[model samples]
Target: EDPEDPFTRYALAQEHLKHDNASRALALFEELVETDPDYVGTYYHLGKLYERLDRTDDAIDTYAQGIEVAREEGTQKDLSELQDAKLKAEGLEHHHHHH
Candidate 1:
């Protein structure tokens, strides 16, 4: 169910997000997520974009989905750090910012 346009749009959206254009990135990721709910990569990216936009709850929810997807796929690596950061994002874990 992956929409080709949505995949391309999501890639471009990541670029925008890197430049601090989160508002625009959010829109694109939302579109991509809707167009392809099972797109695991999109879920992780959406989680990140929401976090940058200060939408913590959305980020948490998105990451929960990502974690589930990863488990289903048996992916041992966790690249996005969403689950690891969840507690910290919720102010339950104290840690330092690298940058």
Candidate 2:
């Protein structure tokens, strides 16, 4: 993985959001999701960005999609995180799963 690769862009995406640059971060993260579907982190951050932008449905969709990927990849950490984010965004709880 080159330092200038998508993973690098991933780090920058979070930084962009941290500086209150949601537009830039959203653009970067959206591209990352398209260009690197296996990058679990992108979905998490992008979903959060959608939530921050008040795009609740979009956030739920993004988190749900990311949860599927996390399951396929066997990334339990991401699975739990995304599930929690999803349930919370939906105004619910993660009572179904032990986490």
TM-score of each: 0.69, 0.84
The model with the greatest TM-score is 2
lDDT of 2 at 10: 84
Clashing pairs in 2: none
Q: Count the backbone clashes (under 3 Å) in each candidate.
A: 0, 0
Query: lDDT of candidate 1?
Result: 0.67
Q: By lDDT, who's the top model here?
A: 2
Residues 1-99 of candidate 2: C-alpha lDDT, one tens digit per residue:
653598788888788888988899899988887877888888888988887887867878888879888989848999999999888878632233322
lDDT for model 2, please.
Answer: 0.81
lDDT accuracy of residue 79 in candidate 2: 97
| Cα RMSD (angstroms) for every candidate in the order listed | 5.9, 4.8
